[PDB]
């Protein structure tokens, strides 16, 4: 579908081909995060630290509960119906997340039946197992620090020092928490927040949180690094200071008739100057349709591209024509730096700008020369079994394309400038030229 | 001022209206940060750690003092005058910050009268109160770690182990500090650095630092997250290794005749294809003047937009015409992804592309159909009291606009492509077309 032979002559060498995968079909599991530690074993050295901490934390947590109440108070069974008049203004994603929240409230009630047990936990990780329905894990922030550092040093340091250490630890915890759970979180009715971000309520240790789930899969790291494991806040307690979070754990599904092709850019020679083609380096092909892809939001592995949603974007007709073999429509830009790549290797064959770099044949010792009419040279073992480029020596294979590659020649597109200020300069100059041409007709 | 009815027909649904607030009128307060801990209670296990640490820290701190001296040595009372010849080259902001520095120098001298007391502090947070004018808080980095961990374990571990632990803690502190206080700090004569960044000299615990100020306000978190609380370095001591920082604490003032309007994008149907309008989603209106806003630098809350400065930017005449009702000038882009939103809710009324998603009327059970000549459908309770879209069931209100919304029709603008490479491709193609038209006249 792409014309690789013509593209290689303007410095676009064929790279690795990769699969396309997107998350789908998530499982759900609920967990409790308690945001105040249990200080019952050091109660004589607490002062008024806990009261001030509770005031600050309540100030942080109140708006989240307020935002959840908007959907909680206006959703009832019919199979569930939302009151559109009461909601007023909302996106589709927000309404869908509200439906999910209503679904989760059923297990939230069963969990909240364990309030007294939740309040009395004294370890960093605890599994509460009362009945088949009343079972949940509880994770408590800063409990490990208190149990390991402060309790063992009682009466080795003064009570005043212990109190100050506790206060500083709580203040540092709040300083770290505010970025994720502060005013930046104006839309808690959603399921797009990553588990890594949610884990900041537990000091950023998402490994332990995921271990409590008990899952097992070979795509675990790929799921994590593609930001596909998310969570949603379902319930906030303003008297015991804990939250309930539902975690969504999906699988990765491969799109069948799709692939993503990478292109490696190499500088080429034209008119005693060095140039680089301005073409997207990743191209998505789905059912023989060509498009761009916003690959900056995806995860690139050796064998596949993994995304949490479809990131395809449209492409202009001229660019699609350039990719299919019309090289006179492929733009180019001048090279004024020494860091631009000068050669590449594809399927055992070398593509090199031997005007800009020294190319030698190790088999015979003779130099490899490029004429002024050639953009770059293809080197395989029909002409040089072993090539030398600087300090690099490479043994080469055979080219599967045309046997007359180096004697054909290609048509060259127009130059462009890609700097941000230069874009405005070019737009203004073109508009002025258009105005001149327009006023020539009137006169 | 905006033509919401016409805009909704090209998928721009009216969203929340918000207020506009900017910081002003700051109060000032000075504090001391000591960057070397007091090791007098473990002096037998220090080795040569402090000497090496002091050498490294002096290397870090010397350029900052050098940069401050440029303004300190060239400013005198007249009501203060700067020697422009000696300064040489400076922006207006730098000169204003220099004036502020000269103003702070008096309280700096008063604080520096407490040098011996500052050097002898042995706790993480201390309040020195000698006279009404000689009063200041001192915050000492790593003192809590030394007091809580290293001192209590003396002779429980070897002196060599204690020394190594102290050295590693100091090295980690320097590794964290270098990003904020290293060569990236070319211009210390300014008051734009946030308090969060400054708190890195105290381990990143800005909550405690702000608590020492003693202020109280309901907009505290909004001030913090909008990056409106800043600080300026006023004095550096290269023999005791401490700095004096002046903190600026402003209020938020609302611009009276201004508001910011949000637009929610929804895909629409035209010529058997799906499209989205390319229009800014946030619009600033001030005294009935329309402009863009660089909202990425601001804080968006439920009721207002909060910024540390005025981020208004100009808008083209064609875009302003598009927003006021001339929809043939609003550009559009093709949709090739399944993630684009297909419906939205505004003031209890549904705007939905029912060609792309299934729409059903729950009251009667009959389907809701959209013709090929309609971009999207408005759904209120005159036609369907309760609507079903997938797994979503919504009860609806009444539309306050025209009663003939679904039978009028609108004019459609031209398509565009927004990819970065496609921009250069389009510019080059337009220039080539212009050249062809120009040369047609000559011949």
């Amino acid at each position, epitope marked *: 579908i792409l014309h690789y032979e013509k593209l290689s002559k303007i410095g676009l060498v064929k790279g690795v081909t990769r699969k396309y995968k997107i998350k789908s079909n998530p499982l759900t599991k609920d967990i409790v995060i308690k945001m105040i530690p249990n200080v019952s074993n050091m*109660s*004589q050295c*607490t*002062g*008024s*630290v806990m009261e*001030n901490y509770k005031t600050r934390l309540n100030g942080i947590l109140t708006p989240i509960k307020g935002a959840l109440e908007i959907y909680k108070n206006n959703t009832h069974d019919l199979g569930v119906i939302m009151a559109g008049v009461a909601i007023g203004i909302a996106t589709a994603a927000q309404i869908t997340a509200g439906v999910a929240l209503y679904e989760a409230m059923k297990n939230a009630d069963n969990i909240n039946k364990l309030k007294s047990s939740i309040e009395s936990t004294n370890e960093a990780v605890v599994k509460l197992q009362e009945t088949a329905e009343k079972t949940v894990y509880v994770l408590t922030a800063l409990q490990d620090y208190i149990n390991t550092n402060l309790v063992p040093t009682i009466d080795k340091i*003064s*009570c*005043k020092q212990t*109190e*100050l250490s506790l*206060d500083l630890a709580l203040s540092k915890y709040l300083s770290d928490l505010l970025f994720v759970f502060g005013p930046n979180l104006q839309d808690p009715v959603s399921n797009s927040m990553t588990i890594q971000a949610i884990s900041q309520a537990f000091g950023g240790n998402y490994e332990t949180l995921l271990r409590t789930l008990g899952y097992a899969t070979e795509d675990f790291d790929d799921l994590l690094e593609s930001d596909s494991i998310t969570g949603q806040i379902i319930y906030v307690d303003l008297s015991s200071y804990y939250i309930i979070v539902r975690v969504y754990f999906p699988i990765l599904t491969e799109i069948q008739q799709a692939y993503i092709q990478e292109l490696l850019p190499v500088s080429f020679n034209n008119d005693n100057s060095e140039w680089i083609s301005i073409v997207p380096n990743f191209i998505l092909v789905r059912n023989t349709l060509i498009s761009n892809i916003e690959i900056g939001f995806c995860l690139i592995t050796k064998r596949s591209v993994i995304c949490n949603q479809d990131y395809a974007t449209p492409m202009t007709n001229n660019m699609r024509e350039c990719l299919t073999g019309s090289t006179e429509k492929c733009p180019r830009e001048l090279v004024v730096s020494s860091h631009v790549p000068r050669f590449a290797l594809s399927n055992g064959v070398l593509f090199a700008n031997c005007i800009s770099v020294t190319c030698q044949c190790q088999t015979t010792g003779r130099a490899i020369s490029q004429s002024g009419e050639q953009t770059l040279l293809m080197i395989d073992n029909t002409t040089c079994p072993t090539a030398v480029l600087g300090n690099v020596i490479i043994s080469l294979g055979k080219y599967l394309g045309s046997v007359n590659y180096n004697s054909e020649g290609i048509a060259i597109g127009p130059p462009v400038f890609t700097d941000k200020v230069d874009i405005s300069s070019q737009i203004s100059s073109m508009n002025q030229s258009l105005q001149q041409s327009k006023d020539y007709i009137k006169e | 001022i905006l033509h919401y009815e016409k805009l909704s027909k090209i998928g721009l649904v009216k969203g929340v209206t918000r207020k506009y607030k900017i910081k002003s009128n700051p109060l000032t307060k000075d504090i001391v940060i000591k960057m070397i801990p007091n090791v007098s209670n473990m002096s037998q296990c220090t080795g040569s750690v402090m000497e090496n640490y002091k050498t490294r820290l002096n290397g870090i701190l010397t350029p900052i003092k050098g940069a401050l001296e440029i303004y300190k040595n060239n400013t005198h009372d007249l009501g203060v005058i700067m020697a422009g010849v000696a300064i040489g080259i400076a922006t207006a902001a730098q000169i204003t910050a220099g004036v502020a520095l000269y103003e702070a120098m008096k309280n700096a001298d008063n604080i520096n009268k407490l040098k011996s007391s500052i050097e002898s502090t042995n706790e993480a*947070v201390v*309040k020195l*109160q*000698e*006279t*009404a004018e000689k009063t200041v*808080y001192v915050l000492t980095a790593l003192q809590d770690y030394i007091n809580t961990n290293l001192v209590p374990t003396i002779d429980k571990i070897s002196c060599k182990q204690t020394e190594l632990s102290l050295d590693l803690a100091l090295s980690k502190y320097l590794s964290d500090l270098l990003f904020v206080f290293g060569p990236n700090l070319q211009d210390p004569v300014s008051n734009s650095m946030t308090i969060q960044a400054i708190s890195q000299a105290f381990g990143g615990n800005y909550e*405690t630092l702000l*608590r*020492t100020l*003693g202020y109280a306000t309901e907009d505290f978190d909004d001030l913090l997250e909008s990056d409106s609380i800043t600080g300026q370095i006023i004095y550096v001591d290269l023999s005791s290794y401490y700095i004096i920082v002046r903190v600026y604490f402003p209020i938020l003032t609302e611009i009276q005749q201004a508001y910011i309007q949000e637009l929610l994008p929804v895909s629409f149907n035209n010529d058997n294809s799906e499209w989205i309008s390319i229009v800014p989603n946030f619009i600033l209106v001030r005294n009935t003047l329309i402009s863009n806003i660089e909202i990425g630098f601001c804080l968006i809350t439920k009721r207002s937009v909060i910024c540390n400065q005025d981020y208004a930017t100009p808008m083209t005449n064609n875009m302003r015409e598009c927003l006021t009702g001339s929809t043939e000038k609003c550009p559009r882009e093709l949709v090739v992804s399944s993630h684009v939103p297909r419906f939205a809710l505004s003031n209890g009324v549904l705007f939905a592309n029912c060609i792309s998603v299934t729409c059903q009327c729950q009251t009667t059970g009959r389907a809701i159909s959209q013709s090929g000549e309609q971009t999207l459908l408005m759904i209120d309770n005159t036609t369907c009291p309760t609507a079903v879209l997938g797994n979503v069931i919504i009860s609806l209100g009444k539309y306050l606009g025209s009663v003939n919304y679904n039978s009028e029709g609108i004019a459609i603008g031209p398509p565009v492509f927004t990819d970065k490479v496609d921009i250069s491709s389009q510019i080059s193609s337009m220039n080539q077309s212009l050249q062809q038209s120009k040369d047609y006249i000559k011949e």
Partner: antibody, heavy 125, light 109 residues
Framework: QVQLQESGPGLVKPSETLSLTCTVS????????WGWIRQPPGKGLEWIAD????????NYNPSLKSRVTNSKDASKNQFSLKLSSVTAADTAMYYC???????????????????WGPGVLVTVS | PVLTQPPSASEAARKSVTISCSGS????????VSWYQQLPGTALKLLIS???QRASGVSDRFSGSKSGTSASLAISGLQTEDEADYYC???????????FGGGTRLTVL
């Protein structure tokens, strides 16, 4: 409102042991610090001891440390003090009080007796 | 160990008076001061804590201050109901407890 009541013997013979009891109404003794103070007739106040019943912690005035014992009873919400080998110098008015201490919001450390009992007079004769 | 107060103080009505309290580095230099009032034949009550914070239901005519190893209590708009004894106290790090002053009796003319 928290209220405290002292109780003890009106007259204590020399070289015997003085026993005092403080009864609290409106709060649990196991969630606060408490303290004992005394004032000789016509003189100033003197601190005796502070106690935290929940963990059994105690701080003593160094002059009186060797003659002071403390006890508690959570069922009746009471705490008791005992001073042994009393002389004529131990006649005074005795008070129990609630004694919170700690850092303020602005990191200033302080101690205070915020609620006082009526007090009981003890005469050694 | 002990804090130093003046045994007596006196000032006419509608005037203002100041009572001083002197200590050391272990108690007043590093910690705050509390002030208590004792009226004739009634229970003691807490007037001031944390060097300047008045208790609930305490008139604004009472103020406190601290400088160095010394502290002061100021009474303005002097009235007849202010005749009492006044005591200062401060936490001492070497004792893990409070130390008291000798007390000052206030007489109004």
């Amino acid at each position: 409102q928290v209220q405290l009541q002292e109780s003890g013997p009106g007259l204590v013979k020399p070289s015997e042991t003085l026993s005092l009891t403080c009864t609290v109404s409106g709060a649990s003794i196991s969630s606060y610090w408490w303290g004992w103070i005394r004032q000789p007739p016509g003189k100033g106040l003197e601190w005796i001891a502070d106690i935290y019943p929940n963990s059994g912690s105690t701080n003593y005035n160094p002059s009186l440390k060797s003659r002071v014992t403390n006890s508690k009873d959570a069922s009746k919400n009471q705490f008791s003090l005992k001073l042994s080998s009393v002389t004529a110098a131990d006649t005074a008015m005795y008070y129990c009080a609630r004694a919170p201490r700690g850092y303020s919001y602005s990191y200033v450390f302080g101690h205070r007796f915020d609620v006082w009992g009526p007090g009981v007079l003890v005469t050694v004769s | 160990p002990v804090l130093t107060q003046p045994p007596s103080a006196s000032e006419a009505a509608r005037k203002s008076v100041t009572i001083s309290c002197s200590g050391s580095s272990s108690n007043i230099g590093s910690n705050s001061v509390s002030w208590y009032q004792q009226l004739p034949g009634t229970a003691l009550k807490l007037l001031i804590s944390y060097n300047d914070q008045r208790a609930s239901g305490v008139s604004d005519r009472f103020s406190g201050s601290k400088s160095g190893t010394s502290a002061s209590l100021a009474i303005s708009g002097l009235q007849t109901e202010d005749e009492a004894d006044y005591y200062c106290a401060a936490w001492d790090d070497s004792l893990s407890g409070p130390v008291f002053g000798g007390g000052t009796r206030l007489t109004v003319l």
